Every structure is written in structure tokens, then in C-alpha cells.
Amino acid sequence: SSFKAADLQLEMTQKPHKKPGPGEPLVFGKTFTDHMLMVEWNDKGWGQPRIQPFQNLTLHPASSSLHYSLQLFEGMKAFKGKDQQVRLFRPWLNMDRMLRSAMRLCLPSFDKLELLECIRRLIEVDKDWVPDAAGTSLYVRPVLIGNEPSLGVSQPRRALLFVILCPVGAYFPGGSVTPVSLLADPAFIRAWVGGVGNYKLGGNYGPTVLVQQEALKRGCEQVLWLYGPDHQLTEVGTMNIFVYWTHEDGVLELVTPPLNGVILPGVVRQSLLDMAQTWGEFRVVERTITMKQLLRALEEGRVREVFGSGTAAQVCPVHRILYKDRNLHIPTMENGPELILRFQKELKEIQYGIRAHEWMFPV
Amino acid sequence: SSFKAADLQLEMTQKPHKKPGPGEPLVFGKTFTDHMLMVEWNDKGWGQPRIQPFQNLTLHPASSSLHYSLQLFEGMKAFKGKDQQVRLFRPWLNMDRMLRSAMRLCLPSFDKLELLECIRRLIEVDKDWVPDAAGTSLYVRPVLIGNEPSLGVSQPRRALLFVILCPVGVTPVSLLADPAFIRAWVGGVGNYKLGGNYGPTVLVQQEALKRGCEQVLWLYGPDHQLTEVGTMNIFVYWTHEDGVLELVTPPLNGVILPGVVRQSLLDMAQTWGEFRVVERTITMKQLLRALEEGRVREVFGSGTAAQVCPVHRILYKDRNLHIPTMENGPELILRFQKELKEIQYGIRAHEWMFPV
Ligand SMILES: *Cc1c(COP(=O)(O)O)cnc(C)c1O
Ligand SMILES: *Cc1c(COP(=O)(O)O)cnc(C)c1O
């Protein structure tokens, strides 16, 4: 059986931390709120969920979370409207994804709606920490880790679920959208079919640090993850990739790679697909995109916009790709970027409550 | 630049724990020793290395070790002979591998010989925990984790290196060879002992058990290359297609973890000079043909925990493949086990052993 939100214990902080305040820079994931959610799992099942003061974790040196990466995480945002109302963006999908990640690592199952209610209560306690300035939000970070005090590679008989919160600034401060340049080198592979790249597991990220540093040395901001001998475009850093172009059959379309096992099923990715399909102005498809297809479309002037999608960036433009020592210029910014700006505006209006929408979950 | 063993902080335990005996045969890595090594790193450099009592770690909930798997480990054994002398098996190779793993994850550099001396001093302190019975030893587990209190995916500005010790204690195994499960890929990180390569294997091992097998035979590529057996390297002893008797193991092209036992078996077999010893790709097609022609003598896995482990069956594409390992002695396996034990327990003096 799962832990219940009705069994939630609340321990308030005796020493509250000084809040950043409007005007001061909010660097991504470095500032933390006053409280955290904590739920323990053992042989007898789940314990009662607790909202306790922000504090360090006490782990046994042999904890399987530190030796065999029995760890997963989620990432979603809570937004504060001008009237101080806080709302979460499609959290049910993050709960769905978190459970799939738990099953892949043989970690304990939980009830998705009970966890969501526990998270709603946590954000409610720390509601004053959610910033209200343009483009700002509260990043919610749920984590489930194996906590077995054994060096055997096996299913944990002990686990720990915790949630921490971070007030974060605008990804594009000032409102102006800025593009990223990408390094596309086939020597670096993020995931493989039959692997775990389609799950938000800690293991998929650590190996990317060295690759990102190589991208920075070569003058690029992020990595374009290529897959297969045909160099299929999969991800842009930790974002899903979208290409807005006129296809080889002459039809205007928005394309993104299909969920074949090497793509992480993003919540923003699904939201852009749902939004574009509702408009019905162009074809919306999930199909494999190769470097040779992109190269042919660029020389024929068929590419309008290329972008990445994700919780941190929302919609991020791509203007340059460094491939085979040659610089490929993508006319994303010269085209507005019309579609990116339209997606950003509509997401902003839904997120900050300007538009009523079923996608938003009130806190 | 690096932490020094000369700068070692010693904090001996008060109120020690009860040492186990053969009254209850212990499970692998569940019983721990009295002390542990601990070294902290920050952007200004390494702190003082400490031998302190076995205690819990205190980590910030945003520690990069827990979110982005900035973690690596090592595994080596210490053996106690009849004259009570404790010796480590080729630890210099484990230190080489650990530093390579560290660089791959953008974790801090350290001097390999300074860490080895700190580990020697730690085992020296907990010397009475190392058992002397047949087939028993002390498993040494060094770990290096990222410890930056940031949710940004970046090079950690804080790290933690710790070492814990475990007193630990031939039957063949059956393997599941399903191409649907991939452990590692060329261009990936399967050739490094990173925590991230192990968590995803738990469900695959459960699938092996569900299908009646004991371990997983990891296949790679369109030609179904045999890469690893569980957390062990794979060896095949056969008469190859050219009619020559040989011992083969997959090469270090990126999908194979460079095992210390693997290297030791290759070195030992090369020194004898009785048959051909090579590093070459082994495919399921080659194995199937060799089994039908009666050319396979023995197949086994190698690693610190299991040492030399016989394989008697492989379940591939819903077909059972009997490997005649046990019906061929197992001559080579027994010879490897005998010679390793002689070197390990100090019956025969060798340069491979590091005295504690
Ligand atoms: C987190 C992530 C995404 C985007 O997911 P969102 O749910 O949209 O935040 C895409 N790709 C990778 C590799 C990711 O880790
Ligand atoms: C640890 C390990 C080995 C064996 O290495 P040894 O140094 O010989 O202990 C082989 N393969 C994998 C996947 C391993 O994790």
C-alpha cells in the first residue's frame, strides 16, 4: 500500500531563511526553500509522509543510491500569478513519469495522486517563496532513491522519497528570446535502444558533464545528441528537439523525434504537440529527423525554426550547429522566431493564470 | 594538488562492534568494519584524509551524487594468510581504474599511491576483521561522489571520497542472453566503474530469474557479441575455427569493463604458453557453431567477488545451449583457481601482492 496525504505530519522551521527578494538574481537550483517533503519505505511498507525543515539527509555509507545509482528525479514548475495564486503545470504527467522511472529501477510504487497532494501541501507551506516577477517560478524537485545498506546489486528493501523546492529566475531575463549553438559530434552517445534514456534517472546525466565541457571549449552552449549510423537528432542538452519546416512533400509541418526509446517523453514536448494539434494550422508529426535531412532542408531553404523544449527553458531557439567541423546556420531568429514566440506567449498565459486551463493545478 | 597520507588524521573507535564468525555465513557486502576513510574536496583543494569510526554520511539533499549520479566506485580484495599477514590483490590497477572513472565524471584528481597508502593504513587499523578461513577475504570498497548543493548539471565544486570494508565469504551458473537488454554502448561509459551502469541492471537480473536463469549474458551489436556476464568479464576456452586451442575474451573497445581478474587470467595464461591467449570479439553465431561441432571446453566469468565462475547453460532466442564446462573438468577453471589462491594467500610469493 501507498503513503496517504491524510497521514501527513507537519514540522515547521524554527529558523526561517532570508528570502532573496525582487531584483536579486536567482541562479537555477542554488537557492532552497524552508521546508522539504520526506517519506521513508522499508519492509513493512511506506511510513507517514512528513513536511520537515530543510535539512541534510543521513545515509548509511553503503546506501545503494550512492553505489549503484538507484536514483530518479522529476522536475516541474509552480507559477505565481499577479494576484498571488500559485499553480502547478500538468503535474499529473510528472507523477506518471516518476512512477515509470520507479518501476524501471525496482524502487517502490506509490499512489500518484497522494504524492501530488503531498507536494501541493509542501508548496502551500512555502508559498511565499514562489516569486512573481516576469518569467520566474518555483522549481519542484521530487526524488526517489534506493537506501539499502548493502553492496549487493539488487532490489532495495529500503527507500527514501524526498521533495525540495527552488525559486528560479527567468530563463530569458528581460523578455527577449536568445538562441543556443550546438555541438553535433557522433562520438558522444546519450542513450541506446534497449537502454534507459527514456527515463529520468540520475545515471543518464553524470556522463554528460564532460561532453558539455567539450561543447563549451568548441564555442557551443549545448550538445546535440546524435544516434545511429544515420545520425538521428534526439535531444538538445536536456531538452527535446523540434524542427519547424516545409517537408520534402511540400507540406508545412512541426516535427519531433518519436518515443522509440532514446527520447525522454517531456511534459513540455507533449504540451507543444497538443497545442499545435489544437490550432490545426499545420501538420504535427512524430518522426525521425536525421542530419542529412536537416542539411538538405537547410540548403533548400525549407527550415524555418529549430528549438528545444523543457521545464527550465520552456522553448529554446537554436541558430547554429557545429557538425563535421562546419558551421550550419539555422535561420530561427530571422524567422521571428514566430512559432517559438507564439508557444512562449500561450504557455505564459496558461501558466500565470491569464487563461483558464485544465492543465493548471491550483495550490 | 592531492591529499597526502602523511597528513592522515587518526580517530580510533571507542565502543567497537561485534565481529562475525562461521556461526552465521554472511551475505556479500552486508557486514561492515569498525572504521572508514573519509576525504573531502572543495574548489580550493583536498582536505585532510581521515580514518574515523564507521558512521553515516551527512549530505545536502541537492547533492549531485543523488540527482545526476556523480558517483563511482571500486572493488578489490585483501587476503589473510596462515601467518596472519594481510595482502591486497593488484591494487595499483584498481587505483588506475578509479582515477580514469573520476576524469570521466569530471570529479577531482588524486594521487593514486597516496590513496593506496591511506587504504593500507585503514586495513591495518581494521586488520582483525580480515578472515583467514578458506575462500574468505576482506572486500574493499572505495567510492568518490560529487557533492555540490546545486541542481545544475555541471562539474562539482565539492566532492567526497570514502572507503568502507566488508568481510566476505565450484557451482556453475545459467545465463539469459536476450538482445533486448543493452548494458553499454560504444561511445558510452560501460568501460568505467560508475554507479550509473548498475542500477538499470536490477530489473534485467529479475527478468533472468523469472526465465529460470541465474545471471545475465550481456549482448551487444547486430551480430550479438558476448560482452559481460552479470558484473563479470567473459572467457571462452575452445578450439577456434582455425583449429587452434585458445582462450579468448572480448577486447577493450568501450563496452567492456577492464577487470583486474580479467587482466590477471590473461597474464597467467600467457606466461604458461600452452595455448593461444587473445582479446577478440566473440559472437553468438561463433559460439553456436562451436557448440554443435563440440569445440567448446569451458566458458566462465571473472571478477573480484566470484573470482572464476563456471557457466553450464545459456538461454538464447528461446533455445537452451548446454555449455560442457563441468564435463571438461573444469580443467582450466580449477587451474586458475589453484594458482590465484596460491598467490592470494601467500603460499607462493608474488609481485602482484601488496603487503598491508
Ligand atoms: C527533463 C528532460 C526533458 C524535458 O522534459 P520536460 O518534462 O519537458 O521538462 C527532455 N529531455 C531530457 C533528456 C530531459 O532530461
Ligand atoms: C567489477 C566488474 C568486472 C570485473 O572487474 P574486477 O576488477 O576483475 O573485479 C567486470 N565487469 C563489470 C561490468 C564489472 O562491474
Report the relative pairing of strands B319-322 and B76-80 from DSSP bridges. unpaired
Q: Which of B219, B304, B308 to mutate to test the pocket of ligand 2 (most atoms within 8 A of CB)?
A: B304
Q: Residue A222: CB within 6 Å of ligand 1?
A: no
Cβ contacts of A145 on chain B, cutoff 8 Å: 66
Query: Is B139 marked as a binding-site residue?
Result: yes
Bridge-based pairing state of the strands A45-46 and A35-42: antiparallel
Q: Residue B194 pairs with which residues in a beta bridge?
A: B72
Distance, in Å, from the CA atom of A196 to the CA atom of A151, rounded to the nearest integer, reads 22
* CB atoms near residue B61 (< 10 Å): 19
Give the dihedral sign, CA B288/B290/B293/B297: negative
Q: Cα(A218)–Cα(A67) distance, rounded to whole angstroms? A: 33
Q: Which ligand is nearest to the CA of A190?
A: 1
Number of other residues whose CB lies within 10 A of the CB of residue A298:
17
Interface probe with B: pick from A57, A161, A162, A239, most Cβ of B within 10 Å: A57
Sign of CA dihedral B339, B345, B349, B352: positive
Cβ of A36 less than 6 Å from ligand 1: no
How far, in Å, is the centroid of ligand 2 from the Cα of B353? 19
**Contact, B3 vs B47, CB < 8 A?**
yes
Residue at grid coordinates 532495495 = A156
- Ligand 2 pocket test: which of B100, B232, B255, B309 has the largest number of ligand atoms within 8 Å of its C-beta? B232
Which of B155, B179, B187 is the closest to A188 by Cβ? B187
CB contact under 8 A, B186 and A188: no
Q: To probe the interface with B, which of A65, A68, A107, A154 has the most B CB atoms within 10 Å?
A: A68
| CA B209 – CA B215 distance, rounded (Å) | 8
Residue A104's CB: how many other CB atoms inside 10 A? 18
**Which residues of chain B lie closer than 8 angstroms to A27, CB-CB?**
152
Q: Which three cell numbers stand for residue A336?
A: 521571428
Structural domains in chain B? Answer: 1-169+342-356 (3.30.470.10), 170-341 (3.20.10.10)
Query: What are the contacts of B7-12 at 24+ separation with CB within 8 A?
Result: B7/B48, B7/B49, B8/B48, B8/B49, B8/B50, B8/B51, B8/B118, B8/B121, B9/B48, B9/B49, B9/B50, B9/B51, B9/B52, B10/B50, B10/B51, B11/B50, B11/B51, B11/B52, B11/B53, B12/B51, B12/B53, B12/B125
Min distance A308 CA to chain B CA atoms (Å):
17
Kind of pairing between the strands at A222-227 and A232-236: antiparallel
B323 phi and psi angles, rounded to 5 deg: -100, 115
CB-closest option in A105, A151, A202 to B66: A202
A187 with B188: Cβ contact below 8 A: no
Stated resolution in angstroms: 1.8
Angle of helix A267-279 relative to helix A91-104, nearest 10 degrees, comes to 130
Pocket of ligand 2 (CB under 6 A): B 75, 193, 228, 231-233, 257, 259-262, 302-304
DSSP element (H, E) containing B118: helix B112-125
Count H helices, E strands: chain A?
7, 20
Handedness of CA B61, A310, B154, A64 (dihedral sign): positive
Query: A91 CB less than 6 Å from ligand 1?
Result: no
**Angstrom distance (rounded) from CA A315 to CA B173:** 51
Q: What cell does A232 get?
A: 538521428
Q: What is the grid cell recorded at B282?
A: 566473440
Angle, helices A338-351 vs A267-279, to 10°: value is 110
